[PDB]
Design a protein around this ligand. Structure first.
Ligand SMILES: O[C@@H]1[C@@H](O)[C@H](O[C@@H]2CO[C@@H](O)[C@H](O)[C@H]2O)OC[C@H]1O
Ligand SMILES: O[C@@H]1[C@@H](O)[C@H](O[C@@H]2CO[C@@H](O)[C@H](O)[C@H]2O)OC[C@H]1O
Ligand SMILES: O[C@@H]1[C@@H](O)[C@H](O[C@@H]2CO[C@@H](O)[C@H](O)[C@H]2O)OC[C@H]1O
Lengths: 638, 638, 638
């Protein structure tokens, strides 16, 4: 059946093209495996809840915007009952029933690993012609808000400019009592009943209320204004839109924005763990998280029931925690051709779950051809990044590009452009960095007080757990570019490491013993054919590399809106260093996990196409793009 | 922490004895492992939703009535806005908002195995001073309702007396449109605003809205009027009160009544299957049910996470489907000392899920010392009755007492009084009927077109599945009593069976082959030391028995309210037949499941105590009570 | 490390090219992950037992014949100590110690589903210059054996010519006592000490004695003379060569022959079940088999640990039970480009486990491009043929080509040439027969007294179990060819079936009920675009077909040794039927299992290449080869 929803329809109608329903949730309550829901032009202020599941990729349930029509789903409501209090501060009042069981003005940003704990923030929000406001703590703070032009990035501890300084003068504050909710905001001179003013109301826009609602496709909608809660790996992880613990979703061609915390969630649900550290306080989140993994396994977490989602061609921005989030629920998924930006820039709250994309247990996840910029952290892989592949992505203007934490691999980062000043946070082992352009520092550190799971290949089955001893990384064909006043760009971080698994084994086995003997020897690194310009430093034992510390490539990423260009100068010597095609055959297996770098299907992986998808010969330029050559280079990269 | 709830309290209070909360759900939203909630006298019209789980039997969360106080939880509301329409018919009207998302007047009795499909019934109800009404189909049926005094028992096809004929004149009917719910009822002359008139409103009284809320004890409440839905093994199975897919609850000392369908549910939740036959219509519930078993297994169904509930010392009556119901969620549970009666007597709807107690997959469930009467069916064990023990129960005045269907055992039925005319529906194999008084017929039938699971011992692990070939039953020390014209009382049903596993094996292996050779031989039966009176007939190959077809025991169960007596005459020959103490050692293992009759803990089981819990010697009177002797017997049995 | 084994070697040697080992088992006791064992020219009389496992597809352990060298592994020994008894009968005697724990002359062909129980046969064998003998039951039968030229095919009950009639005069008989093994045989005039005479000695040739020895490649050997035991699905299933319950073997380019029972085994091991029906006799093999599936599941039977083997480019012939056999151990494997013939033609023993290839639980197994002829039965898929694809194979001169038993699909049989007179035994549902040439009858039957497992897609997880109700099959683009006096060729078998899942559901849901209602409606069949010649008959409701009862295609398969040709005449109308390219989108899902016809990786399957591997046009003619045309066709098919 092909159901139709239109602003001229009726939920008492048949749901056909000639007699369409009025609300999307109406169609969602009757559609079944194989059906399509076509939604016509209009703004739908409702939380859509798919009731029945698709039964296979062929028999999915498809929700999409009519061809050529602008369809918006919002979790907000326009408010036109504001009353001026004094100066530029206005107030509106709503009976609590307006929000029902979930009141964003009563709900707090709360949970494990949330660090901003003295100044409570809530899930509500006020918007003036689309621009969200800043929450303030007291009634008094509403009247003469101070314009701010700079802010502290918590992780890097650097003061950075505020993108939209003007927005800092727009503030809101709310009070919830037993009968009603009173919301105040400073509109700086505008008449809020006259301008287009909205407030957050619902938690989500498109998210099932039951787990297991598989095979749903959601396509071509603009979705916005969702009061989503802090979403750590140890709690339920709702988002503005998400599959809610199921399999085979396809979320594509949507423009998603203004989720209080995470926009798209492919995370876990409450049953396997729900902020026990923050609520019970008897054990840390670390201990509760490794436990949630086993609880999930007992609840059927496996390729047969969970994950294999596709997130593609979406534009996601202006969210406070992530554009994409998820612990466990995203295994085997694919995330590609997305444009992600402006994530967590307002910095109203901070904690260890913020990034454009953050995934825990991203087993065999493929993250490729995405454009991620203007985020405090572009991508964060945290625990169990096994089989994960980060390939052909464009990262720029981020406070940090990539962070892979407490993982054992094998994980692969290939043909990416990582152009931010702080490019890599590496607190893992078992990685392969192949043919990337890396223009920022790398912070590499062992993790000896936290042990995390590893798995059988291409599976959620647990094989064991390990600490991160550091090393056991591969670096081939990368172009590293330092900068005056920037330390740690390159691979010199591994100077004390062995250079082959055979060497590591010979050394460990020089004297009888067990664990202690292994801990006294540094793991091996496999590093060759990298270039180091403008101050980047090489691993001391690399055999074939190109080092020109005094050469400045003058790298620039030129963002012109729908298109982005890469500008880079390369020295004549660039022509004399040639890279090999890497593959399952050329990359040494990771030690602890004892597994190869292969395709998700178990077959050999061959890294022979570059960032621009051009096939390359056995000897070609190093770096992410085969076309780069000595001299001037100006290449369209998006 | 010991929380207090009282009608003088406040939900903004501390919840202490001096500053109590007002609603039980307020305490349920903050209590944590190890806390107790003490509720003071009053009627609490709310659905209590335990929020946090107990963490062990020691650290449970206890909800209880204050010592000596009458505490009532109801799902109904008193209505005093009725307006006379005409005659004795009155009407009230409520906004749909009054019911929230669950409206009993809109929600139908619906689902797999519901047979009364031409006459739509709903989950609502109307009560006059506690007496529920009969729903009618048309507005017109309200004005001159017919008093009925007899009704057809569906399974037995016998017309029987309606217990409360007067009640048949009180009828209701309702309509729900987009805005309002309108209820009409005939009050036969009473003034509904003057009398105490209530209507169903909420689905449950005490039921978590999340699964996994373990170790909760609910004690000393009267709970009533819940609009519970039709609960087959293939759907979500909510009830008036239940653990909702969790472990270790204790439901004791409560008085529960007027659940539309099932009162106490220890069943399954929606995720493992939800009326797929009725909704998708592509495969029968039979096929969907065996699938739900494997779906649950992948969803954690095991002794470590589900079951081990205790339901004791409760009185449960006036429910339309069951006093206790549940598929999968009741494994390893114990049900004892409960008084169950008046279950499904109104017969407003009928289907194959009705009985005082009905349990699917009652693995190792212990059902003992219960008083069950005035039910269309007392107990129904349907599928996987493995390790189940029905012992020392008192069944009387039921259209049928016990039904064990498509199970392979080993299941044990010992020391019971099955006094109804139709005592047993036996559509299984692997049973042991030891020391019972059986005074009604047995209908024994093979089931060759349905195969069902069997398990490893004391576990939910699946070992295989099988059809019911019939036989492979044990009958020792039972007293059978027929009645004029009543056929099939006794054990002659098995006349063609083999008499030992050795004989079955020898006959099967006479000619080479496989399945076909096994199917041509009847399974063995182990029958000895039974007495047959007043028409009961024995297995023709039984070696030691007492048959006195002409002797009438003049059996009578005298129910005097809180006490019940058994009146029974026995012949002088009764003294010459003596029974052995049966045990794991004396009961032959079941053939297909290949398991012994033992205790839930895997230890030897010895059946040396009778119905009155008196220890008995090796040679003792047969039947359920050792005190029974030749002559007159008048014994208190409750 | 590359180890070398040569007849000039020594097992005290280093095992290098210059200082090679002498036996292959010596290399097998020291080789580790990533090593290669190169065996040089010669005959190695030993059972090779791989000791250490390969660790991945990249780090396997490879055993292969040196390039261009003839390497033979045999389980036999040459005997030259024969003494003439009388006439042409000779005798040899050996110490029992010569056979060790396994004596072929003592061991019997024994076990579940073995039907020849009067005539005890043993696992030994005698060969004269490579030609095996027939065992006789009594000493006296040795002296004047009668030449036999015809024999009864047990299944078809037709008397057929004996291929090698002369071989019927060579017989052997043996006795084993406390000390010695004495073997007698009639050499019909030859001198066994002068000729090359061998006897079976060892059970296997290349088989680990431990399970889990994964990732082994065996290439380029000739292997022969193994005293392998009867291998039903309910027992241990050893073979001449096999992985013995592990994952990722590659058995290729070998010539394998004279395995007493099965040659290559990808079956199960003893712990999950071992002839309990035959040994305990309390339950049938059917019951013990369904149990073995669950026992294996608890023993880790899953894609992560078992299966994914590849058997390609081998020639396997002269085996008494199968060329390839296996229950459970072969999941997800691929079998292709093998030449299989002369399987079970001596008929010294018979039972329900015989076929060129027999697999139980062939989940997602791909069987393609195989040439299978001169077998009593070409291929037998028995239980759990889910996701199995039988494609582009050449079947001729077999008493029966294919048998798919008690499976529920989705299973695919496409682009095959099934040229024998008895082409298909179909005792399943859920099949799709696409673009085949089928020249023999089909026997299709329901199986209502045996229920068997089905699974989640692409997994060993159990989803349910079911009887075979019949139907729910698809037949598109097949060319059926009848023959005078041959009945049941075509698709008329399905005449009472519904024609769409919609029709089935509508009819079942005409009257309320459950299983009984579903049982009275015949499952749907999807049949169109088939041709029926020379007496083949169509499904009465097929909409687009070509029926020419009087047209005789005079099909003939001309076997010229290494090349095989197809000769076929087609009518002028042949090109009027235009076939569609089938795929996941065009094949209706199977009903009970509720799954689509997909690729093993879970993606869309498109059948767009023909038997000759030519890309097929959208508007193609039917049958297995797109180039078939009206008139004469003479095509090389091997
Ligand atoms: O379990 C995840 C953690 O691995 C991660 O937190 C890291 C360790 O704790 C902090 O002190 C570190 O700075 C941070 O990188 O995120 C929290 C949780 O998702
Ligand atoms: O699956 C359960 C059934 O075993 C049971 O239904 C039985 C079989 O169908 C009816 O024809 C029989 O009369 C009934 O006893 O209940 C339905 C379901 O819970
Ligand atoms: O379990 C497998 C059987 O399905 C199969 O036996 C079939 C059923 O019994 C016989 O009467 C049939 O002819 C045969 O096809 O093989 C035995 C076992 O492998």
């Amino acid at each position: 059946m092909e159901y139709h929803v239109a602003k001229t329809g009726s939920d008492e109608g048949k749901g056909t093209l000639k007699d369409p329903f009025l609300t999307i949730n109406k169609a969602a309550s009757v559609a079944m495996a194989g059906d399509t829901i076509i939604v016509h032009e209009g703004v739908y202020r409702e939380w859509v809840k798919p009731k029945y599941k698709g039964l296979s990729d062929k028999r999915r349930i498809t929700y999409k915007a009519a061809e050529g029509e602008k369809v918006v789903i919002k979790g907000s409501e326009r408010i036109q009952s504001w009353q001026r209090v004094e100066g530029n501060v206005w107030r509106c009042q709503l009976p609590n029933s307006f929000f029902g069981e979930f009141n964003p003005y009563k709900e707090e940003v709360f949970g494990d690993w949330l660090l901003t704990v003295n100044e409570k923030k809530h899930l509500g929000d006020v918007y003036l012609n689309g621009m969200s406001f800043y929450e303030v703590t007291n009634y008094e703070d509403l009247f003469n808000p101070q314009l701010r032009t700079e802010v502290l990035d918590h992780w890097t501890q650097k003061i950075v400019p505020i993108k939209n300084a003007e927005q800092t003068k727009y503030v809101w504050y709310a009070e919830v009592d037993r009968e009603k909710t009173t919301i105040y905001a400073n509109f700086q001179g505008a008449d809020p009943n006259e301008e287009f003013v909205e407030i957050n109301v619902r938690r989500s826009c498109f998210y099932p209320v039951e787990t297991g609602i598989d095979y749903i496709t959601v396509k071509g909608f603009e979705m916005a204004h969702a009061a989503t809660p802090w979403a750590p790996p140890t709690a339920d992880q709702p988002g503005l839109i998400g599959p809610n613990w199921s399999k085979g979703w396809i979320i594509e061609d949507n423009i998603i924005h203004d989720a209080k915390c995470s926009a798209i969630s492919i995370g876990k649900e409450a049953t396997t763990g729900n902020n026990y550290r923050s609520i019970r306080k008897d054990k840390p989140g670390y201990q509760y998280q490794l436990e949630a993994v086993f609880n999930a396994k007992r609840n059927g977490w496996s390729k047969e029931k969970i994950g294999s989602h596709i997130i593609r061609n979406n534009t996601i921005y202006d969210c406070g925690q992530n554009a994409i989030v998820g612990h466990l629920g995203g295994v085997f998924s694919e995330i590609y051709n997305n444009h992600i930006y402006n994530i967590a820039l307002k910095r109203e709250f901070y904690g260890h779950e913020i990034a454009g994309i953050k995934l825990h247990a991203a087993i065999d996840v493929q993250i490729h051809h995405n454009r991620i910029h203007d985020c405090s952290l572009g991508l964060w892989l945290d625990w169990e990044a096994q089989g994960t592949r980060v390939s052909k992505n464009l990262f720029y203007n981020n406070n940090r590009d990539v962070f892979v934490e407490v993982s054992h691999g094998p994980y692969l980062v290939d043909h990416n452009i990582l152009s931010s000043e702080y490019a890599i946070d590496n607190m893992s082992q078992g990685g392969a960095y192949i043919n990337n352009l890396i223009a920022g520092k790398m912070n590499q550190r062992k993790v000896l007080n936290r042990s995390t799971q590893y798995h059988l290949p291409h599976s959620t089955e647990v094989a064991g757990f390990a600490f991160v001893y550091g090393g056991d990384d591969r670096f081939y064909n990368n172009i590293f570019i330092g900068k005056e006043g920037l330390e740690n760009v390159g691979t010199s971080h591994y100077n004390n490491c062995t250079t082959s698994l055979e060497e590591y084994i010979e050394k460990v086995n020089e004297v009888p013993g067990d664990l202690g003997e292994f801990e006294r020897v540094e793991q091996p690194v496999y590093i060759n054919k990298n270039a180091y310009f403008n101050g980047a430093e090489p691993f001391e034992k690399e055999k074939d590399n190109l080092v020109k510390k005094d050469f400045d490539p003058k790298l620039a990423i030129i963002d012109e809106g729908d298109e982005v260009y890469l500008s880079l100068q390369l020295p004549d010597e660039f022509e004399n260093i040639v890279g090999d095609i890497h593959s399952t055959k050329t990359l040494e297996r990771v030690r602890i996990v004892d597994a190869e770098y292969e395709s998700p299907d178990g077959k050999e992986l061959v890294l022979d196409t570059d960032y621009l998808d051009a096939k390359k010969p056995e000897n070609s330029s190093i770096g992410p793009i085969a076309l780069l050559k000595k001299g001037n280079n100006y290449i369209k990269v998006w």
